[PDB]
Amino acid sequence: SRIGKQPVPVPSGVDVTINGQNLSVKGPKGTLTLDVAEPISVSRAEDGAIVVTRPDDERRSRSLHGLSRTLIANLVTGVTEGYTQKMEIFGVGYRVQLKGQNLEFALGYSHPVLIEAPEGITFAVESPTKFSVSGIDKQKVGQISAVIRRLRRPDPYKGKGVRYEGEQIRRKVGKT
Amino acid sequence: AKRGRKKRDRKHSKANHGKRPNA
Amino acid sequence: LIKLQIQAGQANPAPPVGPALGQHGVNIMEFCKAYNAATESQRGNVIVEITVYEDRSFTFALKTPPAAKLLLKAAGVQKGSGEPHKTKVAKVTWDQVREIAETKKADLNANDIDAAAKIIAGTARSMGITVE
Amino acid sequence: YRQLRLERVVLVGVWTEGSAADAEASLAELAALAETAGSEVLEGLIQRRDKPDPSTYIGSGKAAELREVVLATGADTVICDGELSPAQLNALEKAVKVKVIDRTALILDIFAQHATSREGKAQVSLAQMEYMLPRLRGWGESMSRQAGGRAGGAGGGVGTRGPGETKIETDRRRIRERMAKLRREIRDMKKIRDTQRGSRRRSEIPSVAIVGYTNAGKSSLLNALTGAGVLVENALFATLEPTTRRGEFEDGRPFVLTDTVGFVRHLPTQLVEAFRSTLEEVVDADLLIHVVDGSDVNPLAQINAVRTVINEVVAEYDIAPPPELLVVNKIDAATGVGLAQLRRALPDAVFVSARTGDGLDKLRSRMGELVESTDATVDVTIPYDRGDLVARVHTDGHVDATEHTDAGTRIKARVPAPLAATLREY
Amino acid sequence: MKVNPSVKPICDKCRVIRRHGRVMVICSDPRHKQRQG
RNA sequence: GCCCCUAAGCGUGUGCUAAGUGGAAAAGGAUGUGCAGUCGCGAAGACAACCAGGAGGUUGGCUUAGAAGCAGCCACCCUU
Numbered sequence: 001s002r003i004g005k006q007p008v009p010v011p012s013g014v015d016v017t018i019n020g021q022n023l024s025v026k027g028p029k030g031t032l033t034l035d036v037a038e039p040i041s042v043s044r045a046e047d048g049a050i051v052v053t054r055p056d057d058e059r060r061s062r063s064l065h066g067l068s069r070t071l072i073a074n075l076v077t078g079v080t081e082g083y084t085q086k087m088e089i090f091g092v093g094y095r096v097q098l099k100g101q102n103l104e105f106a107l108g109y110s111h112p113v114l115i116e117a118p119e120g121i122t123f124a125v126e127s128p129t130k131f132s133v134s135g136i137d138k139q140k141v142g143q144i145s146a147v148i149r150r151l152r153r154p155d156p157y158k159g160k161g162v163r164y165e166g167e168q169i170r171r172k173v174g175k176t
Numbered sequence: 177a178k179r180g181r182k183k184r185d186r187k188h189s190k191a192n193h194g195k196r197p198n199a
Numbered sequence: 200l201i202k203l204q205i206q207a208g209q210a211n212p213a214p215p216v217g218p219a220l221g222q223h224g225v226n227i228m229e230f231c232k233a234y235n236a237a238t239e240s241q242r243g244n245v246i247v248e249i250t251v252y253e254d255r256s257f258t259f260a261l262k263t264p265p266a267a268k269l270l271l272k273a274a275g276v277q278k279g280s281g282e283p284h285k286t287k288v289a290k291v292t293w294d295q296v297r298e299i300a301e302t303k304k305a306d307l308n309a310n311d312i313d314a315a316a317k318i319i320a321g322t323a324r325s326m327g328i329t330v331e
Numbered sequence: 332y333r334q335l336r337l338e339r340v341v342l343v344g345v346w347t348e349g350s351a352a353d354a355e356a357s358l359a360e361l362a363a364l365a366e367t368a369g370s371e372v373l374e375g376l377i378q379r380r381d382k383p384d385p386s387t388y389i390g391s392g393k394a395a396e397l398r399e400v401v402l403a404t405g406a407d408t409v410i411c412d413g414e415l416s417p418a419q420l421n422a423l424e425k426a427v428k429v430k431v432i433d434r435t436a437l438i439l440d441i442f443a444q445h446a447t448s449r450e451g452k453a454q455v456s457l458a459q460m461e462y463m464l465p466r467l468r469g470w471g472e473s474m475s476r477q478a479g480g481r482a483g484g485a486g487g488g489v490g491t492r493g494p495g496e497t498k499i500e501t502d503r504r505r506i507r508e509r510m511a512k513l514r515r516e517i518r519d520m521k522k523i524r525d526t527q528r529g530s531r532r533r534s535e536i537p538s539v540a541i542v543g544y545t546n547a548g549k550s551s552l553l554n555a556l557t558g559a560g561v562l563v564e565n566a567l568f569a570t571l572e573p574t575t576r577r578g579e580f581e582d583g584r585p586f587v588l589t590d591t592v593g594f595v596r597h598l599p600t601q602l603v604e605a606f607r608s609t610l611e612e613v614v615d616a617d618l619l620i621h622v623v624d625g626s627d628v629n630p631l632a633q634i635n636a637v638r639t640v641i642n643e644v645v646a647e648y649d650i651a652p653p654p655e656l657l658v659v660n661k662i663d664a665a666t667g668v669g670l671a672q673l674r675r676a677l678p679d680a681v682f683v684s685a686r687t688g689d690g691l692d693k694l695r696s697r698m699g700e701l702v703e704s705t706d707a708t709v710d711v712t713i714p715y716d717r718g719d720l721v722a723r724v725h726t727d728g729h730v731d732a733t734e735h736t737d738a739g740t741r742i743k744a745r746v747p748a749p750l751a752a753t754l755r756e757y
Numbered sequence: 758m759k760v761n762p763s764v765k766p767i768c769d770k771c772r773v774i775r776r777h778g779r780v781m782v783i784c785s786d787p788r789h790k791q792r793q794g
Numbered sequence: 795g796c797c798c799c800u801a802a803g804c805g806u807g808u809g810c811u812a813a814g815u816g817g818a819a820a821a822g823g824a825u826g827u828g829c830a831g832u833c834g835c836g837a838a839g840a841c842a843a844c845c846a847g848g849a850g851g852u853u854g855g856c857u858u859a860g861a862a863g864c865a866g867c868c869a870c871c872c873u874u
C-alpha cells in the first residue's frame with residue numbers, strides 16, 4: 001500500500017461518480033467506467049481525490065486494493081491527458097499511411113495490411129515511417145499498439161518491422 | 177501397471193486400515 | 200571531441216593519426232598546424248587534454264605518462280607489466296614526482312581531490328613496476 | 332561392457348597369406364590390442380598354412396600343439412589373429428577348452444572398453460549385434476546350447492495353442508528388430524556440424540582432418556597445433572570421437588582441425604557405423620593429414636593400410652582424392668637412425684616431437700599453402716579520413732602489411748569473398 | 758522455449774516466475790526461455 | 795459413516811488449502827501458512843522513485859586489427 005494508500009488526485013475538469021461499487025469518470029478527453037472488485041471500498045474524499053481502502057491485509061486484498069487504486073489513477077490520467085504511443089517502422093520500403101480512420105502498413109507482404117482503428121482509438125502519422133496511437137483507455141491503447149507491433153514477425157537480422165518509439169530489439173548477425 | 181497399482185493402493189483406505197487381501 | 204593517451208614518444212602514431220590524419224574537413228591541415236605551431240622542439244610523449252572545438256585552437260598540456268611510473272617520458276621506455284606487484288624493472292623516486300606539470304589531481308567523479316602523489320600506494324602500482 | 336581376462340599371454344601368427352614379416356606385424360598388432368585390453372606379452376610363435384581350416388580353423392594338429400602350450404601356461408589368453416566363423420569358433424573351443432581370442436571380438440570389446448560417449452557406445456553395441464547375430468544357435472556359448480529353441484512339437488495334430496513362426500526365425504527376429512531400431516537410431520551429427528558445414532565452409536573456414544594409423548599421434552598433433560587437452564595415451568583407440576579444435580595461420584581463416592579414430596588394418600568392417608564419425612570427416616575434409624612417428628614400425632605398411640580404406644570410402648562417396656599430406660613429424664628422440672631411406676622414399680621431416688622439438692613451421696606452411704585460397708590481391712585504397720573506410724577489413728579478413736606503410740598509400744588485404752567485391756571505391 | 762521438468766536460471770539475467778500455474782524462466786536471452794512441463 | 799444418491803451433520807470452534815489438492819506416484823521451483831533466527835532500518839531515513847555525478851596518469855599497462863572503461867589478462871589496495 002505504499003502508493004496503494006496514496007490518494008488519487010483529481011485534476012479540475014475531471015468529473016468522478018461512485019455509484020457504489022462501480023466508478024465512472026467524465027473528463028476532457030472522454031469518459032471511462034470501471035468496477036473495482038468486491039473486497040475493496042472506493043469513495044471520494046472531501047478534497048476531490050479518490051480513496052481506495054481494503055478490509056484486511058490478506059494476499060488477495062493486499063494485491064487487489066493496490067491494483068484498483070492505482071488503476072483508477074491511470075483512468076484519471078487517461079481522461080485528462082490521454083495516452084499516446086509513438087512507433088517507428090524500419091526496413092527499406094516499409095511505410096505506413098493513414099486512410100482516414102484506418103492505418104495501412106506496407107510490411108513487405110504481397111498485400112498492404114490495413115488495421116481498422118478500434119472504437120475510441122485515433123491514429124496519427126508524423127511520416128510514412130513514424131506514427132502513433134492515441135486513446136483514453138490505456139489498456140486498449142496498449143493492446144492495439146501491441147497488435148500493430150506484432151503485425152510483422154521479429155527480424156533480428158536487419159530489424160525490418162514495427163517498433164515502439166524507444167525500443168532496443170534483439171539483433172543478431174548472419175555472416176552468410 | 178495402472179490396474180495393479182490401483183488395486184494395491186486402494187488398501188490405503190479408512191475401512192481397510194492399510195491392508196487388503198493380495199495386497 | 201577526442202581523448203586518447205598514446206605512449207609512443209613520437210607525434211605520428213598509427214592508431215590515432217590514421218583516422219585523424221586528415222579528418223574534420225574544416226581543419227584537416229588547420230588542426231595539424233594548430234597543434235604543431237609550437238612545442239615542436241619538445242618531445243611529444245603524450246601530446247591529450249584536447250577537449251573539443253570547431254576550429255581546433257586551444258592550449259596543450261602533457262598531463263603525465265602512466266601513473267605507474269613517470270619515467271616513460273624521462274628515460275624513454277615503452278613497456279610495463281601485467282601482474283599485481285610483479286616486479287620493478289624501473290627505478291624512480293621523488294626526483295620528478297613533486298610537480299608533474301599542472302594536471303588534475305582529482306577524481307573522475309565529483310568525488311575528492313586526492314591524487315598524483317598517490318603513486319606510492321594509490322592507483323599506480325597496479326602492475327608492480329613503480330617507485331623502487 | 333563385454334570385457335575379458337587376459338593378464339598373461341602367448342601369441343601365434345596364423346600367416347595364411349603374405350610374408351612372415353607381415354604375419355609378425357599382425358601378431359604384434361593383436362598383442363598390442365591385447366595389452367590395450369590389459370595384459371603382458373610373453374612370446375609369439377608362427378605357422379604357415381593355406382586357406383583356414385573350415386572346421387578347426389587352425390587344424391587338429393596345431394589345435395593340439397596349442398592346447399599343449401595352453402596347459403603349460405595355465406592361463407586363458409592365447410592369441411591368434413583372424414576372423415573366425417561360428418563353426419571355427421566352435422571347433423577351436425572344443426579343442427582348447429579355454430578362451431582364445433579373435434581379431435573381430437578383440438577390436439569390438441576394446442571399443443567397448445574405450446567408449447565414453449553415448450553415440451560411440453551405441454555404435455559399438457550395434458557392432459556387437461552385427462558380430463553376434465551370426466554367432467547364434469551355432470557358436471560356443473550359444474542360445475541353443477542344447478537348451479534353447481525348445482518349442483518344437485507344440486501342435487501334434489492341433490489344439491488350443493501354438494506360437495506360429497519358426498523358433499529360430501523368431502529368435503533371430505528378436506535381434507533383427509533390435510538392430511533395426513538401433514540403425515534407425517543413427518543420429519545426424521550434421522546438425523552439430525552445420526555451424527561450420529554451410530557456413531564457414533563456404534565462409535572459408537577450411538577443413539584439415541588428421542587421419543592415420545592408431546598410436547601414430549593424431550590426438551597428440553591436434554593438441555600441439557590447437558592448444559587443446561585431448562586424450563593422449565599409448566593404448567589402441569586412445570581417441571574415441573573425432574574431436575575438433577581451432578587453429579589459425581598467417582593467412583588467418585581458422586583451419587578447424589579435426590582428429591579421428593586411427594586405423595590399423597583389415598578392420599572388422601561391421602563397425603563402419605562407428606567409424607562414420609571419421610569417415611564423414613574425411614569426406615567433408617579439404618585437407619587430409621597422415622601422421623607418422625619417427626621410430627614407427629615398418630617402413631611403410633600402415634600408410635597402405637590407412638590408404639586402402641581412404642580410397643575405398645572416398646571413391647564410393649565422391650570424385651575425390653582429398654588433399655593428403657603425408658608429413659613426417661614427431662621424429663626427434665625417435666632413437667633411430669635408419670630414417671634416411673624413408674626420407675628419400677618420401678621427402679619430409681618436420682619435427683614437433685611432442686612439443687619437445689617444436690619445428691612445425693614447415694608443417695604450418697604446408698597445411699595452408701596446399702589448399703588455402705580467398706579473394707586475395709584486392710586494393711582497398713581509402714582516404715583514411717572517414718574511419719568507416721578502414722572498417723571490417725582488418726577485423727574480418729587479414730591484412731598482410733603490403734604497401735600499407737601509411738594510410739595514404741595502396742592498401743591491400745586478403746579478405747573474405749563477401750566482405751569486399753567492388754568496395755575499393757577509388 | 759525449453760520445456761523441461763527442471764527449469765532453473767541459466768544466467769544471472771534469467772528470472773523464475775509462475776504464470777498460469779507453471780514455473781517459467783524468462784530472460785532477455787531467449788535461449789534461456791524455459792517452461793516447466 | 796453422517797450434503798443427495800444413502801439414515802442424522804450442507805455439526806460447533808480455531809486454522810490450512812486454490813490444485814478439484816482432497817480423489818495415485820520418483821520430482822525443479824518457491825511467492826500460501828505460520829516459524830526462528832540475520833546484515834544494515836529506525837519516523838539518528840532504510841529496499842525505492844524523481845536522483846546535477848560522463849575522462850584522476852583514466853587508450854592506465856596487456857600490448858599493438860583498435861587493444862580507448864569495454865576479446866582477453868591477475869591488479870588497481872586511493873581522497874575536503
Ligand SMILES: Nc1nc2c(ncn2[C@@H]2O[C@H](COP(=O)(O)OP(=O)(O)CP(=O)(O)O)[C@@H](O)[C@H]2O)c(=O)[nH]1
Binds near residue numbers: 546547685
Ligand atoms: N615417443 C613418441 N611417442 C609418440 C609420438 N607420437 C605419438 N606418440 C605416442 O602415442 C600416444 C598418443 O597416441 P595418439 O596421439 O592418441 O595416437 P592416435 O593417432 O590418436 C591413435 P587413437 O585415435 O586410437 O588414440 C602417446 O602416449 C605417445 O607416447 C612421438 O612422436 N614420439
